[PDB]
């Protein structure tokens, strides 16, 4: 109809105006500014602890708030809490569904969340008078496999599903309070800001969106990738984030300036990225490639400075401690390794 | 124990108990057969479940001292390639196809028919990168109505390059050959074809026979005898 044609034309001319406005402020590049700093030397890490006991592919992990404990999730149907200092096991949580894709650890250390491919997010209580671990709340309402989940606080949690939607839950009531829509492809990962006010979600449509927790409405949209976006994480400062996609290319974006800053790729790498994480100071970028090893990138010079090759299968989960003392990498060979 | 305190030896003992429990529970799930059920829609994949009935749907049953676990993931309604790698260690794949759908037309497109949709979905599943050595079991459902449908309307609509006797036996054989021709390996993957009967004993027996052959082939490869 005539109304359809005129509305489509209006949408197109907004896109041209957005592109023109974005290109107008691209006065300089980050490479020119950081061309004067001295490059960091070769980064060498060794495995200090080896964590064994899993009998299936490891799909997720998350460091504790005290930088001493961590949790791991595998497809065998078990959730194991590890003491990284002495390798000892603290808890072993059976799962109702053997298929799990994500896990999370509460900032207060009292609860652990898990879920994936079952449309339900389960919350487990660690500090129980009876001395065991029991489920406390099951959140349902999604129509697709859950890809990520992060604890906003002791009472609220945000999850992303495969039905191009994101929701914010309330553990006390168990009902959704805010729903985020607008994506075209399945959302694969999310990250929370240090101040827990905003968050970013990457989807399969090669686009990232910035959302507002309090307002519940989208703020900005970032594009530039050519394939599915697998990982995302904020900068320690909180004004930038890095994305890892399946075209063998990592990118760094910004919030105040809606333009691309760096591209991290090599002609010898044709393999996708499964995990992305920064360091304490935001200088080293750890990207978990699915070609049986991990790479270390300098965020300011986009130059490789170290390779972590100690796994015999795909690397799927990667984490960094709060104090930046060590990193933990999990793989499909059911082995966790702490590098320092 | 020379340096550990009184509160650290007990912690080590607790960790050893956890390790023992994990090993005991890990050897019980290594003797269970895992099967993946796939279909193209209204192909009878819900009737085949009731025949051997004791997000994702899990069904567990026993037959001749062997435990089977079948997973239904047809209601996921999401991208297939984003989670298909999870079902990489399955023993075999059960496929349901209705051979009486050669005359019905798809709702989305009038020109497209349901028979070709099943054919293309089978080709994608069979030639996947994660199922290079996974055997496929093919079931031809709703074979009773095929006989009555083949006399009033010839099967030339679906296959315009077919010239047969217009009988049930020749038509069924031609359809089976077409589906079996989609295989591109022919050396590492074996396809088992069966016609579903009214009774349920034959269907379960065929599945039991198929998985037994698959298990022995894996056992021979593992021990290096073949």
């Amino acid at each position: 109809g005539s109304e359809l044609d005129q509305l489509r034309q209006e949408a197109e001319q907004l896109k041209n105006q957005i592109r023109d406005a974005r290109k107008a402020c691209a006065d300089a590049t980050l490479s020119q500014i950081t061309n004067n700093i001295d490059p960091v030397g070769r980064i060498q890490m060794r495995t200090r602890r080896t964590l064994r006991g899993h009998l299936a592919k490891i799909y997720a992990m998350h460091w504790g708030t005290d930088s001493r404990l961590l949790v791991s999730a595998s497809q065998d149907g078990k959730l194991i809490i590890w003491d990284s200092y002495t390798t000892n096991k603290v808890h072993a949580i059976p799962l109702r569904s053997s298929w799990v894709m994500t896990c999370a650890y509460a900032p207060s250390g009292n609860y652990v969340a898990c879920g994936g491919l079952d449309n339900i997010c389960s919350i487990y209580n660690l500090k129980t008078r009876e001395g065991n671990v029991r489920v406390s709340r099951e959140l349902a309402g999604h129509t697709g496999y859950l890809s990520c989940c992060r604890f906003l606080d002791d009472n609220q949690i945000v999850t992303s599903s495969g039905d191009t939607t994101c929701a914010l839950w309330d553990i006390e009531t168990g009902q959704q309070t805010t729903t985020f829509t607008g994506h075209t492809g399945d959302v694969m990962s999310l990250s929370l800001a240090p101040d827990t006010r905003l968050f970013v979600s990457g989807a399969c449509d090669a686009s990232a969106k910035l959302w507002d927790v309090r307002e519940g409405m989208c703020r900005q949209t970032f594009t530039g990738h050519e394939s599915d976006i697998n990982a995302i994480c904020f900068f320690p400062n909180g004004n930038a984030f890095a994305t890892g996609s399946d075209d063998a290319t990592c990118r760094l974006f910004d919030l105040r300036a809606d333009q691309e800053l760096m591209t991290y790729s090599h002609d010898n790498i044709i393999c996708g990225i499964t995990s992305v994480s920064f360091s304490k100071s935001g200088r080293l970028l750890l990207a978990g490639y699915d070609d049986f090893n991990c790479n270390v990138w300098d965020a300011l010079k986009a130059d490789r400075a170290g390779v972590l090759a100690g796994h015999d299968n795909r690397v799927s989960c990667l984490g960094v401690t709060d104090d930046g003392m060590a990193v933990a990498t999990g793989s499909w060979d059911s082995f966790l390794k702490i590098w320092n | 124990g020379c340096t550990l305190s009184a509160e650290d030896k007990a912690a080590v003992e607790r960790s050893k108990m956890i390790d023992r429990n994990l090993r005991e529970d890990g050897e019980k799930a290594a003797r269970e057969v895992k099967l993946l059920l796939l279909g193209a829609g209204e192909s009878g994949k819900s009737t085949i479940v009731k025949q051997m009935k004791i997000g994702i749907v899990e069904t567990h049953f026993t037959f001749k001292d062997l435990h089977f676990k079948m997973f239904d993931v047809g209601g996921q309604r999401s991208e297939r390639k984003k989670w298909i790698h999870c079902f990489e260690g399955v023993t075999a794949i059960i496929f349901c196809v209705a051979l009486s759908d050669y005359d019905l037309v798809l709702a989305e497109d009038e020109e497209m028919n349901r028979m070709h949709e099943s054919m293309k979905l089978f080709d994608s599943i069979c030639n996947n990168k994660w199922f290079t050595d996974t055997s496929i079991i093919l079931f031809l459902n709703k074979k009773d109505l095929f006989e009555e449908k083949i006399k009033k309307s010839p099967l030339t609509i679906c296959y315009p390059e077919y010239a047969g006797s217009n009988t049930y036996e020749e038509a069924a054989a031609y359809i089976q050959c077409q589906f079996e021709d989609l295989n591109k390996r022919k050396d590492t993957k074996e396809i088992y074809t069966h016609f579903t009967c009214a009774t349920d004993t034959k269907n379960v027996q065929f599945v039991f026979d198929a998985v037994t052959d698959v298990i022995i082939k894996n056992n021979l490869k593992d021990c290096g005898l073949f």
């Epitope: 001493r68 404990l69 003491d83 000892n88 603290v90 008078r129 009876e130 001395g131 065991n132 | 340096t3 305190s5 009184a6 509160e7 650290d8 030896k9 007990a10 912690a11 003992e13 607790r14 108990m17």
Partner: single-chain antibody, 232 residues
Framework: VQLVESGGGLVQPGGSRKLSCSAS????????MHWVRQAPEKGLEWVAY????????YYADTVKGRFTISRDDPKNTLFLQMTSLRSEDTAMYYC??????????????WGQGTTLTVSSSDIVMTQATSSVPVTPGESVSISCRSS???????????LYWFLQRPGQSPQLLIY???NLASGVPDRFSGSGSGTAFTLTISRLEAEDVGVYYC?????????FGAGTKLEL
Amino acid sequence: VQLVESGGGLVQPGGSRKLSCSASGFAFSSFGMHWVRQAPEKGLEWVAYISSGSGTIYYADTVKGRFTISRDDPKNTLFLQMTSLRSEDTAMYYCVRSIYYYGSSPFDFWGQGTTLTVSSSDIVMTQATSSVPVTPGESVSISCRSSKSLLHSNGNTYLYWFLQRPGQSPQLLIYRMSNLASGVPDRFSGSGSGTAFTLTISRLEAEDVGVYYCMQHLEYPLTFGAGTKLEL
């Protein structure tokens, strides 16, 4: 959670008796158990300890080779047996639960208690103070002293502070000399280093009257301190 104990009574010097305790409200299969003996009008001392799964069994040197402790996981019952009871075997017995992992608080629930009467190197814990009058509304300090250093290499300080009200089972207050227990107010606090340790109360009320004991857990046997009493 509760513990019910039975089997006490009056026995002759020549004879044997057994004591039993029944656990409920928690997972008895993953909790270590301890036995505590409290002599009348005197202090209390540890007796025996059994681990989770009957892995390690420890006995006190005083009654080593005479007492037998056994555990029954399916029925949630712990047994103790005494072969030959002497004159100095008359006291009140308590059963204590304890779980050991990173961040756990052992010696949490002390049970109720049972009575038994009979017809007629190691770190020592000392407490110079025996009784001090006090008026509610002012700070109270209690000091305990040891003979060695309880600070381990890992940084832990295995010292426990617990209170016993008149006619009531002891309740844990401070574990590892720094961490507060669960269900107790914030008035109680503990601070110490090396050999000398102190327990401090900010505001005093009528429910704080009792007897204070200091325990060490660096190595077996576990030795308690002299009873310190507070008068209203």
